[PDB]
C-alpha cells in the first residue's frame, strides 16, 4: 500500500463464493488482493520490531592500553608484587626471567617478574536477547478507489499487531471494512539469536557464535572485563622488561564475519526500538464486508481528458489519471480492447468501478491489459478517450 | 555566482512568512542548499539543509516542526516556509550553498524581526543635570523617551534652535518590543538657571509631539 | 555537543600581523579537520577566506593564513590593512549528527585612529518618573575607540541580575562609537538601596559612575 | 638506516555523511561536484522509481552517492635495500674484569 | 607501535586503500567504503571497519 | 602541545555549588577516561580528592564530584565551606609517550566575608633616594576583599608602560588582602611631569591617589 509504487508485487484472486483469502507478506513487498465485485485491496508489511530487548552481553572489539608496569626480583629472593595485580580491571601476567651477574643478581637462574597494564574498552558490541513473544509488526492497508498519489498516505490504514492480537480491521469510509488475521513467521529466521549492534550497525547473530567469540566480554552494567587476554598478550621477558602485544581493533574481523547476516536498524528518538530486516507474515483477510461505492451511478457521458497518460508500471499493468470536468456523481467506463469497432473488453480492471463524485475530479485508474497490441478505451461515443498500447 | 534573498520584514508572533533565495551563475540543481540565521548577541546557526534533488532534508530541533525548506529547480529558487513563528526567530537569515562538506557561498541576508508590539507613542521624562565639570564650569542633562515603536523618532531642543554639543543616542530594542533612547546636551555651570530648554520628541507613526522642561 | 568559542574583539595596527583563535569544546571534534573561516563586512554577504584549516579559495590574498593545533584553529592576517575591518566567523564540521558548528564571531579593529577612553554619564531617576510608578537608571557612554565595551551594574556593592539592557555600539559622526545602557527597576528598589553604580569596561580599564536617591 | 618509503596502506578510515543527487528516469544522469575530487568515495547506480516517489515514468533513475574520505590510521611500507644493512658485533676477552 | 617484515607480493595484494607517500590521493577507497543498493532516493554507506 | 586548560580563578560564597572545568585536546582527557583531581592548600602537600573521573579516595566528602563529557572534565563542589578555599589541579594520562599532563591550576576563593574597598597610600620619591640619581614611587594597597586588583600608573594623565613592578595580592592576618606597586623613574622624569597618579581598580570601582614634586 500503495502497491503501484512498490516494485516487487503480487496479485491474488479469490473465488466468487469465498470469504477468506490467504496471503504472505514479506519485507519490502506488497500484495494486491482482488475479489469480484469488491474493491481491490493493497496490503504491505511495514516493519517487524522489538521494543526494548533485554541486554545480555557486551563484547569488546577495541581496547586501548596504558604503559606496562614491571616489578622484578632476583632468583631465590621471592615473588615480585604490584598492587595493580589485585584490581579486576587490569591485565597482568606472572612470569620468570633469566637473571644472573650480567643483570644484577648473585645467582644465575629464574627470577620472578610481573607485568600489568590497565585495560579500558574503547568500543564494544552489545548483545541483546530477544523475546520471540514480544515481536511487533505494522501492516499497511489501502483500497484502489481513485486516489491521486498525493493522497495515498491519508487513505492508508496502518494496522498494529502483537504476538497475540485479535483480528485487526481496516475500515474505509464508503467502502466498508476488511479484517486481517495475521501471524509472524519467526521460526526459521529467529532461532537462538542475539541482536548484536555496534555504534552504527546491527545484526542478528547465532547465540552460540557470539558466546564463543575470542574477545573480552562483560556483564553489561559495570562489570569486570572477562577474558582480557583475547586482546592483551604479554610476550616472554628479556631481563627486566616485558612488552605487551595489543591484538588490535577487531571491528573489521567482526564485520567481514557478519556480511550476509540478517540486519537490524533503529528508529528516530526511539533508541530501544529495533527493526528486524527479515521474516514474513502470514495473513487471512476477510473481504465479505467490503463494498463498492457508486454502483448506482450513471455512466459518465461528458468529454473526459487524460491528466496523466497510461504509463507502464513494471507490474504488467498501466496507470493513468482521467479528469472529469462535467457530469455529476457518475462512474467512469473503462475497457481495454484489440479493436476500436467492437467494444469487447480484454483486460482486467484493477480499479474496480471507477468513479468521479465532484466535478473536475482527477481519478487514478490501474488496468491490466492483455498481451500484444491493444487499445485503452475510456468513455463512450464521440468523446471517448482512446490511447494505443502494446504489452510484451 | 550570487544568491539573492527576499521575504524579510516585521510579522506578529504565531504568524507565517516565506523567505526566498534566487540563485544565478551555476547549475542550482546539482548543489546542496541550506538556510542559516544569526540572532543578536548569538553566533551563526544553520537551521535548514536540503539536498540537490530535495529528496534529503535536515532541520535543527529548534525549527523542526515549524520551518519547511523547499527548492524549485526549474526556477533556481530556494524557499524557507516559516510557520508558527516565535520571538526567538528574530534573526538575519542567509541562504548558502554547500559543496565539499563546507558552506561555500552566501547571500547578503534578509532580516526578519518579530514583534508583538503595537503603535505606541512615547512618554518623556526630564533628566536632572549634575556637575560634569572637570574643574570646571560644565553640566549636562537630557530627556528620556521611553516605550515607543516603531522607528524613527526625532528629538530636538528649543524647537529648531540649539544644536551645540547635543548627543542623541540611537534606540534600544527591548523585552517589551518597544524602543527607547536618550538625548543629552552639555552647558556651562553658572548658566543652569539663566535659560530654559525643552525637547521636541516627535513620533511620526503615532503623530506624537511632546515638549518637556528641564531644571535642577 | 559542539561549541566553538573565539574572542569577541581583537585589534591591531596597520602593517602588523594579528591572530584570531577558535577553541573547540564538544565531544569529539578532532576527526575531520575541515575548519573554515569567513569574512563579513557590515551589510554584505559572508566571504569564504579559508577552508580545510589551511586551504585558500581562489583569489583570496596570501596575507590570510590558518593553522590548527589540538582543539584550537587559528586565523592569522599579516600586513594589516584598513580594508580588513570586518567580522570573522569560525566554522567546523562537528560530526555526522549535527554537522557544521559556528563560533560566536570576532570583530577585527584596525587602529586607523588612537585609543580613546570611554566617557560616561550616569543619571538618577527623575522625580517625574517615580510618579509614574517606575524608575530607570540611564548610563550613557561616548568617545571610545574601538567600539568594544562591557557593561555591568551594581546595587550598592552587588551586581544586578535583572533589568540590564545593553545595546550594540553605534558609530558617531566623529569616527567614534556610542552605546546606551538602561536599568528598569521599581521605585521601592531605587529608594531601598544606598546607591547604584554603572561601570564600563573598555580595553582592560574600567570606568565607574554612581547615583543615589 | 632510512629505508625507502614505498606505500602507505590505510586500515582505519573515518567518513562524513553521504551526499546524494538523483534524477527521474529519462531525465539524465545525476551529478555532484564531489565526484570530480580525488579524496571522495563515490558511486554511480540506478534506482527503481515511479509515481510513488516523485517520477512521471516507472524505471531506473540515475543516482550518485559521495562521501569525503580521510585516513585515520595507516600502515607504512618501506623497501629493504640489502646492500645497506648494518650490523654491530660486540667482542670481549676473558681477562678477569668485574662485570661492572 | 608495531613493525614486521612482510612479503611484497602479500602487501601489494592487500584489499585496503593505499597511498603513494606524498600528499597523494587515496586509491581503491572501496576496500573500506562500500555503498549499498538504493531504495528510492536514499543510499547509505557500508563502512567495512578498522 | 598537550596541556590541560582550566580557569585561573573561580569564586563562590559559603553554601552554594561551584564547578571547575578542565578542557583538554581530543586525546588528552578523552582516550583513557582516567582523570584525577588534586587539592592543595598553601604550603601543604597536594591531596588526591578524585581519580578515574568520578572515583573518590577514602575519606573524601560527597561534596566533591567529577564528570567528563568529551574534552572537558569537571570538578563540582557542593555545600561550599571555608575549608574549601585552596588550589585545585587537573591531571590526565595523555598516552604512552608523555604519560601525565596537568592543568594550570584554579584558585577557589570562598566569600566567607563582605566587600571591602582598597585603601591606598601613595608615597613620593625620597630626597635621599633622588641624591643617588634614582626615583621610585611607592603605591601601597591595603585592606581589600576579594584580592582581584588592577593597578595602573599615570604620567600627569598618561598611562605608564615601563618601570612597573606590581606584586600579586597577599593574605593579611585579619583575613583581608594587600598588594604593592613600584614605579621606577629617573629624577628628571619626576621633575619634568606635573604629577604622577597611582590608581587601583577593584570590582569595577577605582581608587586614585596622586603625588607631585615639591
Task: Give chain A as a 3 state SS string.
Answer: CCHHHCCCEEEEECCCCCCEEEEEEECCCEEEEECCCCCCEEEEEEEEEEECCEEEEEEEEEEEECCCEEEECCCCCCCCCCHHHCCCCEEEEEEEEEECHHHCCCCCEEEEEEEEEEEEEEEEEEEEECCHHHEEEEEEEEECCCCCHHHHHHHCEEEEECCCCCCEEEEECCCEEEEEEEEEECCCCCCCEEEEECCCCEEEEEHHHHHCCCCCEECCCCCCCECHHHCEEECCCCCCCCCEEECCCCHHHHHHHCCCCCEEEECCCCCCEEEEECCEEEEEEECCCECCCCCCCEECCCCCEEEEEEEECCCCCEEEEEEECCCCCEECCEEEECCCCCCCCCCEECCCCCEECCCCEEEEEEEECCCEEEEEEECCHHHCEEEEEEEC
Q: Beta-carbon neighbour count of residue C161 at 10 Å?
A: 8
- Length of chain E counted residue by residue: 50
Among candidate residues B10, B27, B215, the one with its CA nearest the CA of residue B129:
B215
Among candidate residues F164, F163, F169, F182, the one with its CA nearest the CA of residue F142:
F169
Return the residue in B98, B143, B152, B170 with the most chain C beta carbons within 10 A, the one to mutate for interface testing.
B170
How far is the alpha carbon of F43 from chain C, nearest alpha carbon, in Å? 32
- Whether there are 3 or more C-beta pairs closer than 8 Å between D and A is yes
Among candidate residues D24, D27, D22, the one with its CA nearest the CA of residue D51:
D24
Among candidate residues A144, A160, A104, the one with its CA nearest the CA of residue A273:
A160
- Length of chain C counted residue by residue: 213
Question: Please, which residues have CB within 8 angstroms of residue A53's CB and are 6 or more apart in sequence?
Answer: A128, A129, A130, A131, A134, A195, A272, A274
Q: Which of residues 115-134 of B touch C (CB under 8 A)?
A: 123, 125-128, 130, 132
Q: What resolution in angstrom units was achieved for this structure?
A: 2.8
Helix, strand, coil shares of chain B, percent, nearest 5, are 5, 50, 45
CB F172 within 8 A of CB F185: no
Report the distance separating Cα A49 and Cα F73, nearest Å.
38
Q: Beta-carbon neighbour count of residue B33 at 10 Å?
A: 24
C-alpha cell at C45: 554577504
**Coil/strand/helix, residue F102:** strand
Chain F's closest residue to C209, CA to CA, is: F205
CB C153 within 8 A of CB C137: yes
Strand F196-202 relative to strand F150-155, pairing: antiparallel
Return the residue in A5, A149, A150 with the most chain D beta carbons within 10 A, the one to mutate for interface testing.
A5
Decide if F69 and C27 are in contact by the 8 Å CB cutoff. Answer: yes
Beta-bridge partner residues of B170: none
Report the distance separating Cα F115 and Cα F145, nearest Å.
6
CB C152 within 8 A of CB C201: yes
Decide if A200 and E49 are in contact by the 8 Å CB cutoff. Answer: no
Q: Look up cell 540478517; give the residue.
A: A262
Residues of F in contact with C1 (CB under 8 A): 70
**Coil/strand/helix, residue B159:** coil
Decide if D20 and B51 are in contact by the 8 Å CB cutoff. Answer: yes
Residues of B in contact with E42 (CB under 8 A): 55-56
Question: Please, which residues have CB within 8 angstroms of residue B61's CB and are 6 or more apart in sequence?
Answer: none
CB B11 within 8 A of CB B112: yes
Beta-bridge partner residues of A367: A318, A349
C-alpha cell at A16: 466468487
CB of F1 within 8 Å of a chain A CB? The answer is no
Report the distance separating Cα B90 and Cα A260, nearest Å.
51
Q: Beta-carbon neighbour count of residue F93 at 10 Å?
A: 20
Among candidate residues A193, B117, E39, the one with its CA nearest the CA of residue D46:
E39
Among candidate residues B158, B155, B145, the one with its CA nearest the CA of residue B187:
B158
What strands, in cross-sheet order, belong to the sheet with F150-155? F158-159, F150-155, F196-202, F205-211
How many C-alpha atoms does A150 have within 13 Å on its Cβ side? Answer: 4
Report the distance separating Cα C86 and Cα C9, nearest Å.
11
Residue B58, H or E segment: strand B57-59
Q: Beta-carbon neighbour count of residue B25 at 10 Å?
A: 10
Report the distance separating Cα A188 and Cα D95, nearest Å.
81
Beta-bridge partner residues of A114: A71, A94
- Whether there are 3 or more C-beta pairs closer than 8 Å between F and A is yes
Q: Beta-carbon neighbour count of residue A224 at 10 Å?
A: 13
Decide if C93 and D70 are in contact by the 8 Å CB cutoff. Answer: no
Report the distance separating Cα C30 and Cα D66, nearest Å.
22
Beta-bridge partner residues of F142: F119, F178
Chain F's closest residue to A68, CA to CA, is: F96
| Alpha helix ranges (H) inside chain C | 187-192
Report the distance separating Cα D8 and Cα D82, nearest Å.
21
Report the distance separating Cα A80 and Cα A99, nearest Å.
14
Question: Please, which residues have CB within 8 angstroms of residue F95's CB and are 6 or more apart in sequence?
Answer: F27, F31
Decide if D33 and B32 are in contact by the 8 Å CB cutoff. Answer: no
Question: Please, which residues have CB within 8 angstroms of residue E19's CB and are 6 or more apart in sequence?
Answer: D7, D8, D9, D10, D71, D74, E25, E26, E27
How far is the alpha carbon of B154 from chain C, nearest alpha carbon, in Å? 17
Decide if A120 and F33 are in contact by the 8 Å CB cutoff. Answer: yes
Distances (CA, A) of F86 to A201, F39, F40, F81: 48, 7, 6, 11
C-alpha cell at A245: 602485544
Distances (CA, A) of C52 to C75, C150, F1, F27: 12, 34, 20, 21
Report the distance separating Cα C184 and Cα B172, nearest Å.
13
Residue C205, H or E segment: strand C205-211
A206: left (phi over 0), alpha (psi -120 to 50) or beta: beta
- Whether there are 3 or more C-beta pairs closer than 8 Å between F and B is no
C-alpha cell at D33: 561536484
DSSP string, C95-155: -TTT-EEEB--EEEEE-SS--BPPEEEEEPPPTTTGGGT-EEEEEEEEEEBS---EEEEEE
Report the distance separating Cα B184 and Cα B130, nearest Å.
12
The domain over range A298-391 is classified in CATH as 3.40.50.300: no
C-alpha cell at B36: 542559516
C-alpha cell at C82: 584598513
CB A4 within 8 A of CB D50: yes
- Please enumerate, as own/partner, the contacts of B97-100 that have beta carbons within 8 Å and a separation of 24 or more: B97/B3, B97/B23, B97/B31, B97/B32, B97/B33, B97/B34, B98/B31, B98/B32, B98/B33, B98/B34, B98/B49, B99/B31, B99/B32, B99/D33, B99/D34, B100/C51, B100/D33, B100/D34, B100/D37, B100/D68
CB B7 within 8 A of CB B109: no
Report the distance separating Cα C213 and Cα C193, nearest Å.
8
Residue F189 carries which DSSP code? H
CB A158 within 8 A of CB A265: no
Q: Beta-carbon neighbour count of residue C184 at 10 Å?
A: 17
Residues of C in contact with D16 (CB under 8 A): 32, 93, 96
Decide if E48 and A255 are in contact by the 8 Å CB cutoff. Answer: yes
Maximum distance among all Cα pairs of chain C, rounded to whole angstroms = 64
Residue F188, H or E segment: helix F187-192
Q: Look up cell 602593517; give the residue.
A: C15
Report the distance separating Cα C181 and Cα C142, nearest Å.
12
**Coil/strand/helix, residue B216:** coil
CB B51 within 8 A of CB E41: no
CB C143 within 8 A of CB C118: yes
Report the distance separating Cα B35 and Cα B68, nearest Å.
11
CB F22 within 8 A of CB F29: yes
C-alpha cell at D18: 553521504
Cβ burial of B196 (10 Å; 0-12, 13-18, 19+) is exposed
Among candidate residues A299, A304, A2, A327, the one with its CA nearest the CA of residue A148:
A2
Decide if D51 and A6 are in contact by the 8 Å CB cutoff. Answer: no
CB of E41 within 8 Å of a chain B CB? The answer is yes
- Length of chain D counted residue by residue: 100
**What's phi and psi for A298, nearest 5 deg?**
-80, 155
Q: Which of residues 135-194 of F touch C (CB under 8 A)?
A: 150, 152
Among candidate residues F150, F153, F148, F208, the one with its CA nearest the CA of residue F177:
F148
Decide if A67 and F99 are in contact by the 8 Å CB cutoff. Answer: yes
**What's phi and psi for C73, nearest 5 deg?**
-110, 140
Decide if A67 and F96 are in contact by the 8 Å CB cutoff. Answer: yes
**Coil/strand/helix, residue B42:** coil
Q: Beta-carbon neighbour count of residue C59 at 10 Å?
A: 5
Among candidate residues D18, D27, D25, the one with its CA nearest the CA of residue A7:
D25
Residues of C in contact with B58 (CB under 8 A): 99
Residue E12, H or E segment: helix E8-12
**Omega into A2 within 30° of 0, i.e. cis?**
yes
CB A65 within 8 A of CB A233: no
Amino acid at each position: 500500500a500503495h502497491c503501484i509504487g512498490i516494485t516487487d508485487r503480487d496479485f491474488i484472486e479469490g473465488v466468487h463464493g469465498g470469504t477468506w483469502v490467504s496471503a504472505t507478506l514479506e519485507q519490502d513487498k506488497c500484495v494486491t488482493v482482488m475479489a469480484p465485485d469488491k474493491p481491490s485491496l493493497d496490503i504491505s508489511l511495514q516493519t517487524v520490531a522489538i521494543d526494548g530487548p533485554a541486554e545480555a552481553r557486551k563484547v569488546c572489539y577495541s581496547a586501548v592500553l596504558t604503559h606496562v608496569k614491571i616489578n622484578d626480583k632476583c632468583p631465590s629472593t621471592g615473588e615480585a608484587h604490584l598492587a595493580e595485580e589485585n584490581d579486576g580491571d587490569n591485565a597482568c601476567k606472572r612470569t620468570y626471567s633469566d637473571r644472573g651477574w650480567g643483570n644484577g643478581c648473585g645467582l644465575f637462574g629464574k627470577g620472578s617478574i610481573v607485568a600489568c597494564a590497565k585495560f579500558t574498552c574503547a568500543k564494544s558490541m552489545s548483545l541483546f536477547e530477544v523475546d520471540q513473544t514480544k515481536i511487533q509488526y505494522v501492516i499497511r492497508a489501502q483500497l484502489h478507489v481513485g486516489a491521486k498519489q498525493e493522497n495515498w498516505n491519508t487513505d492508508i490504514k496502518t494496522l498494529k499487531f502483537d504476538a497475540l492480537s485479535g483480528s485487526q480491521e481496516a475500515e474505509f469510509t464508503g467502502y466498508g471494512k476488511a479484517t486481517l488475521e495475521c501471524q509472524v513467521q519467526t521460526a526459521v529466521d529467529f532461532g537462538n539469536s542475539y541482536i548484536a549492534e555496534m555504534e552504527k550497525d546491527s545484526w542478528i547473530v547465532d547465540r552460540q557464535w557470539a558466546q564463543d567469540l575470542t574477545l573480552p566480554w562483560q556483564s553489561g552494567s559495570g562489570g569486570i572485563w572477562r577474558e582480557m587476554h583475547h586482546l592483551v598478550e604479554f610476550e616472554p621477558p628479556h631481563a627486566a622488561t616485558i612488552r605487551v602485544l595489543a591484538l588490535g581493533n577487531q571491528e573489521g574481523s567482526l564485520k567481514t564475519a557478519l556480511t550476509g547476516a540478517m540486519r537490524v536498524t533503529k528508529d528516530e528518538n526511539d533508541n530501544n526500538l529495533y527493526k528486524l530486516h527479515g521474516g514474513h507474515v502470514s495473513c487471512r483477510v476477510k473481504l465479505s464486508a467490503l463494498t463498492l461505492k457508486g454502483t448506482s451511478y450513471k455512466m459518465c457521458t461528458d468529454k473526459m481528458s487524460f491528466v496523466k497518460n497510461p504509463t507502464d508500471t513494471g507490474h504488467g499493468t498501466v496507470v493513468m489519471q482521467v479528469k472529469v470536468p462535467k457530469g455529476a456523481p457518475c462512474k467512469i467506463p473503462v475497457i481495454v480492447a484489440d479493436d476500436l469497432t467492437a467494444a469487447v473488453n480484454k483486460g482486467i480492471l484493477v480499479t474496480v468501478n471507477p468513479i468521479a463524485s465532484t466535478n473536475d475530479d482527477e481519478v487514478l485508474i490501474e488496468v491490466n491489459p492483455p498481451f500484444g497490441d491493444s487499445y485503452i478505451i475510456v468513455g463512450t461515443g464521440d468523446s471517448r478517450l482512446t490511447y494505443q498500447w502494446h504489452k510484451e | 555566482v550570487q544568491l539573492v534573498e527576499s521575504g524579510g520584514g516585521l510579522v506578529k508572533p504565531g504568524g507565517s512568512l516565506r523567505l526566498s533565495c534566487a540563485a544565478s551563475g551555476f547549475i542550482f540543481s546539482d548543489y546542496y542548499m541550506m538556510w542559516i540565521r544569526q540572532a543578536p548577541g548569538k553566533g551563526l546557526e544553520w537551521i535548514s539543509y536540503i539536498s540537490s534533488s530535495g529528496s534529503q532534508i535536515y532541520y535543527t530541533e529548534s525549527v523542526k516542526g515549524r520551518f519547511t525548506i523547499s527548492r524549485d529547480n526549474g526556477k533556481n529558487l530556494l524557499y524557507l516556509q516559516m510557520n508558527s513563528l516565535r520571538g526567538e526567530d528574530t534573526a538575519l537569515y542567509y541562504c548558502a550553498t554547500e559543496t565539499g562538506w563546507r558552506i561555500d557561498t552566501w547571500g547578503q541576508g534578509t532580516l526578519v524581526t518579530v514583534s508583538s508590539a503595537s503603535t505606541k507613542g512615547p512618554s518623556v521624562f526630564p533628566l536632572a543635570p549634575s556637575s560634569k565639570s572637570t574643574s570646571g564650569g560644565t553640566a549636562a542633562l537630557g530627556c528620556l523617551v521611553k516605550d515607543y515603536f516603531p522607528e524613527p523618532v526625532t528629538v530636538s531642543w528649543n524647537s529648531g534652535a540649539l544644536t551645540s554639543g547635543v548627543h542623541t543616542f540611537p534606540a534600544v530594542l527591548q523585552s517589551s518590543g518597544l524602543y527607547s533612547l536618550s538625548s543629552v546636551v552639555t552647558v556651562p555651570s553658572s548658566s543652569l538657571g539663566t535659560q530654559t530648554y525643552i525637547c521636541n520628541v516627535n513620533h511620526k507613526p503615532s503623530n506624537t509631539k511632546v515638549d518637556k522642561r528641564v531644571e535642577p | 555537543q559542539a561549541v566553538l568559542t573565539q574572542p569577541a574583539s581583537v585589534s591591531g595596527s596597520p602593517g602588523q600581523s594579528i591572530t584570531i583563535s577558535c577553541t573547540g569544546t564538544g565531544s569529539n571534534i578532532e576527526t575531520y579537520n575541515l575548519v573554515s573561516w569567513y569574512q563579513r563586512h557590515p551589510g554584505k554577504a559572508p566571504k569564504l577566506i579559508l577552508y580545510e584549516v589551511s586551504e585558500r579559495p581562489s583569489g583570496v590574498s596570501n596575507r590570510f593564513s590558518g593553522s590548527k593545533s589540538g582543539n584550537t584553529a587559528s586565523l592569522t592576517i599579516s600586513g594589516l590593512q584598513a580594508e580588513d575591518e570586518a567580522d570573522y566567523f569560525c566554522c567546523s564540521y562537528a560530526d555526522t549528527n549535527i554537522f557544521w558548528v559556528f563560533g560566536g564571531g570576532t570583530h577585527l579593529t584596525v587602529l586607523g585612529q588612537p585609543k580613546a577612553a570611554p566617557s560616561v554619564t550616569l543619571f538618577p531617576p527623575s522625580s517625574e518618573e517615580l510618579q509614574a510608578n517606575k524608575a530607570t537608571l540611564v548610563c550613557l557612554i561616548s568617545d571610545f575607540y574601538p567600539g568594544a565595551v562591557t557593561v555591568a551594574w551594581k546595587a550598592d556593592s552587588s551586581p544586578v541580575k535583572a533589568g540590564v539592557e545593553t545595546t550594540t555600539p553605534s558609530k558617531q559622526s566623529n569616527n567614534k562609537y556610542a552605546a546606551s545602557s538602561y536599568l528598569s527597576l521599581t521605585p521601592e528598589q531605587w529608594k531601598s538601596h544606598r546607591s547604584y553604580s554603572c561601570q564600563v569596561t573598555h580595553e582592560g580599564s574600567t570606568v565607574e559612575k554612581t547615583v543615589a536617591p
